[model samples]
Target chain A: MTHPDFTILYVDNPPASTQFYKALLGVDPVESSPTFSLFVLANGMKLGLWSRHTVEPKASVTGGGGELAFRVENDAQVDETFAGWKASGVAMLQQPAKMEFGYTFTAADPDSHRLRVYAFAG
Target chain B: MTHPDFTILYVDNPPASTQFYKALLGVDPVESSPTFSLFVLANGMKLGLWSRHTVEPKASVTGGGGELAFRVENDAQVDETFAGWKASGVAMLQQPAKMEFGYTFTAADPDSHRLRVYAFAG
Candidate 1:
């Protein structure tokens, strides 16, 4: 296996969340349907939004737990990006602050999936 | 933002899941403790396993609903990887099969988080 893995989230309404992420991510999903949608990032990684109602075996999972952390080169970048996400009408789970790991903050998508931006302790 | 991002999962026992991924991904976690484990992959992406019980502001999420798909260069690579994963005593959710997009299979981790492997159509 090379690398660049895929991440999938369970969304109650795939198409609805698809639209939200389109604006949130600023990239349209490669495949957007009522049942599923997939976005291929510039890094070659993939993100999927699957309808919870149709997912196999039925997922009992809810959001607000999984995280997609964004690592920035400096504190200014983290703060800058955080400001953009916050202004996008996305929910802020936490404001940027210095932590043991460095400067970091958390935000949530329409599905309440956590998206963290961080400036590592490097 | 540069590129490669981070993916975090909720685990019942961080230390236990840490060992699981060590064998599964053939990489040691950069930070491994009872509460969390972080693995920096060759592609510069990060995967974190956080203690489910301690994830705040309290995670109501369950496992078996998340996915991390491994992308292999060819069908043979996918099969070889699948065989290796199967022998590792991990639970298999689905065996290798030809799909519209590519050849793929699915597996699970200690907490039943889904792991998928695939070869793209291209």
Candidate 2:
């Protein structure tokens, strides 16, 4: 069956956003252009950064309404990642804390797209 | 390497939106509640529907900003899937056609989140 294998984000600048994701994901986009960038991730999915002005059909909304959640093995990794990201100057949105679902924290990309890291609690 | 495994969408009503995704994805959410629903999809990623009112730190934006892109094996599958989905009451945004990227179509969920299906051009 077909499933959602790619997640595309509308960004103000594709090449600039590509740099941000490269730093955060530790992987550079396989395809990068002025209007778009494509990253083939290790997790068997792809991420696309598309220019807000150039994307066909024109996206009307912006970020901060949703999240791309990264799941880790445990709570300590969540803290570890938070520390690393905060040190790297990633915009921290929420500090690592226990939520109903897991121990998680929220960060942001250049476009204010929420990047959440969490580890499920037993 | 850790990667994004879950994508969350904020909607007006979780239960109502859950039903919409259930029909569109042809799978049931593994977890469902008044404020959230989680679908563990076959494509090695998870899709979450969260209550717009309850998400922490508060999301200010709405849908239509980005897209969950579904990749098909061929152009014919894109058209076939488009026909099936349009007939099944899905809101069609863009019709199947060849673009710089590939043959593609766009649809929307209840919250106006774009759903794009495409086949990569050789």
Candidate 3:
């Protein structure tokens, strides 16, 4: 694997999720459609939004497991993001709190996939 | 959001999942414990294995939603990864096939998470 990484989040509405992430990530999707959307992040990481029903082998609509966490440089950045996202109607799951690692806040995308903002313990 | 990246896969057994990914990524977890583990990938991307039971809001042990895809440089590499991962005991979900995008294959990790290897149409 050239990059050793990447992820695709299966959403019920690919185009809608693409728009959500576009606003959230502050970047346009490099590839997009009604069934899928692909965003290439600044660090060369790729995040995708694919239609759950359309995914080959039919991916489950149920989203669980863990999170697509976004790391911030500090605690204030976590709060700043929380405020901005909240104002933008992002679903807040957890308010800013210091966890086992450090400061963090949790939110969910339109498809109910977990999204977290954190400042590492380091 | 400094790098616009990252993810954490929730697993029933963090230590065991850490080990599985260690083999997959060929890297030791930067931090580890019974409940949580974190790995820094070659691309400076961060991945974590957090126990489902121990997550802040009690993450569901059930894994689904999307896939973590590995991009190889070519079609040959896609097949190569398929064979290697299959022999290494990774669960096969779909055999290599030419799709709308290109050539690809899919597999599942122990917790029923999808993993895919693909070569984009060049």
Candidate 4:
């Protein structure tokens, strides 16, 4: 069977996180509930926010640590976006750099969640 | 647009994890690929395992720590399952108890990932 286009995570503050994502990714809210919210980005990806207390509890998994990497159009776009984010005072975990995989950079959300954006070098 | 049935997570060991989940949830595999595997549970929930290196990376989100809770049919099943798991030498994080939410217990997977099973108290 087909799987969800993306995962929906239950968070404590939906609107605040939604606003941060909206400005960070320049995306728009697709759905919103008093207890939940969703944002659709340009890459056809969806980020969901839900009420933490009301939703099902999540599991603790170790050693599977990493950041969510988004593949953008090109390296230049990655650099430009990184510069924009740095200017916006978003916490940068790592600066933009060329990696064996591709061009990459890391930043953290207002809640200290790590977000990575990258693209292939042309 | 409607969302897909559930989320698919990329994991390092598809087959081994699939087997563990199959035995743990007593479910059947819905689909299997060289790079991925899907398991469908009795409650219509689906779990997908994919190649970690090939799939997109995951982000580090803090204060969002919790375990995936399954709503079993009854409290007795929860007890029986917990007993069986304990016998099988699965790591127990917590014992079965009646929480404000319901009756619940916690167990860890082979990878040390926490799993919680619960049902509403009658």
lDDT against the true structure, per candidate, is 0.71, 0.75, 0.74, 0.55
* Top-TM-score candidate index: 3
Full-model lDDT, candidate 1: 0.71
Model 4 segments more than 4 A misplaced: A41-44, A51-55, A58-66, B1-122
For all predictions, the C-alpha RMSD in Å is 3.2, 2.1, 2.0, 8.1
Cα lDDT of model 1 by residue, B14-121, tens digit: 766778788887778888666778888886567888676755445655553567778788899888887787787777767588866678776766577767677877
- lDDT per residue for candidate 1 within A43-122, as digits (tens), equals 65678786767555356555634677777788998888777867877777765778667787777766777676778886
Candidate 4 local lDDT, B7-107, one digit each (tens): 44444667777776666667667777676676655444445554555443343332233234545777887887787777766767666778654686656
Q: What is the TM-score ranking, best to worst?
A: 3, 2, 1, 4
Pairs that collide in candidate 3 are none
Task: For candidate 1, give the lDDT of residue B44.
Answer: 51
Assess chain B of each prediction and give its TM-score.
0.87, 0.85, 0.87, 0.72
Q: What TM-scores do the predictions have?
A: 0.79, 0.89, 0.91, 0.50
Q: Across residues A26-47, which tens digit of lDDT does each residue of candidate 3 receive?
A: 8888877667788888776888
lDDT of 4 at A65: 31
- Over B1-122, each residue of candidate 3 has an lDDT whose tens digit, in order, gives 23357887777877667778887767888788767898888775777776778666555655464477788889998887777777777767776789777787778877766676788896
What is the C-alpha lDDT profile of model 2 across B28-79, one tens digit per residue? 9888776778888877778887676877656645554657788889998888
Best by lDDT: 2
DockQ, Cα level, model 2? 0.60
Docking class of 2: medium
Off by over 4 Å in 2: none
